[PDB]
């Protein structure tokens, strides 16, 4: 079985929530969880990896993510 990697999600206010995901995980599931925990609609947010938009069906493998990589969350434009 594949291992989880731990990603740090940083919000507009510098708060952090870490997520464990597999390399094959579609990141919509992370986005949904994050939005839930912030008490806001998922479509009000955009999630960036190294400044690039993370798609619902992006995986960490597709994005070249590794342990301790950072996702930033901004308001949708």
């Amino acid at each position: 079985e594949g291992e989880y990697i731990k990603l740090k999600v940083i919000g507009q206010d510098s708060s952090e929530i870490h997520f464990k995901v597999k390399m094959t995980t579609h990141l919509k599931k992370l986005k949904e969880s994050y939005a839930q925990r912030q008490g806001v609609p998922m479509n009000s947010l955009r999630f960036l990896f190294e400044g690039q938009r993370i798609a619902d069906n992006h995986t960490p493998k597709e994005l070249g993510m590794e342990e301790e990589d950072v996702i930033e969350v901004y308001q949708e434009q």
């Binding site: 989880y4 731990k6 952090e16 929530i17 870490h18 464990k20 995980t25 579609h26 599931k29 969880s33």
Partner: peptide, 17 residues
Amino acid sequence: AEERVVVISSSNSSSRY
């Protein structure tokens, strides 16, 4: 804040509805 780690889990004939 305390550390927060969330585990994202992977992606029927018993059903009754």
